[PDB]
Amino acid sequence: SMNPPPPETSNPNKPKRQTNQLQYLLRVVLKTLWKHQFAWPFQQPVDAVKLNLPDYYKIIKTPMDMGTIKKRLENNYYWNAQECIQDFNTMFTNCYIYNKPGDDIVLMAEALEKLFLQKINELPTEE
């Protein structure tokens, strides 16, 4: 009935690197989705307490959100671009698991995912 703690965003025990793919994921992919008119419900963990959704974290056991993804990129949580792409995919899949076809939040998720796929289909080459 409490919210879970948000996902880990900075792990000192993880090695860190800068790559053109990770720079692109923060500065092009995340930044573009972040500034979208429909971004705001995805910029932080679902607050199931304040929204009074007592079943949200009974159904969604792998929560993810763009606030968490942004901090993960900012703090080198991802070594491989695929780890970041997986987190975006998890965020969209959670929305489609919990919500119903035609729901306002689902139409918002679809618009962001369309933009996500447009941007990640132009990811730069791997070192």
Ligand X SMILES: CNC(=O)c1ccc2c(c1)nc(-c1cc(C)c(O)c(C)c1)n2CC1CCN(C(C)=O)CC1
Q: Which residues bind ligand X (CB under 6 A)?
A: 41-42, 46, 51, 53, 95, 98-99, 104-105
Closer residue to ligand X (CB): 9 or 99? 99
Closer residue to ligand X (CB): 11 or 47? 47
Q: Residue 102 region, left (φ>0) first, then alpha (ψ -120 to 50), else beta?
A: left
d(CA 52, CA 86): 28
Which stretch of DSSP H or E encloses residue 104?
A: helix 104-120
Question: Minimum Å distance from CB 120 to ligand X?
Answer: 19
Closer residue to ligand X (CB): 75 or 99? 99
Question: Minimum Å distance from CB 108 to ligand X?
Answer: 6
d(CA 30, CA 98): 23
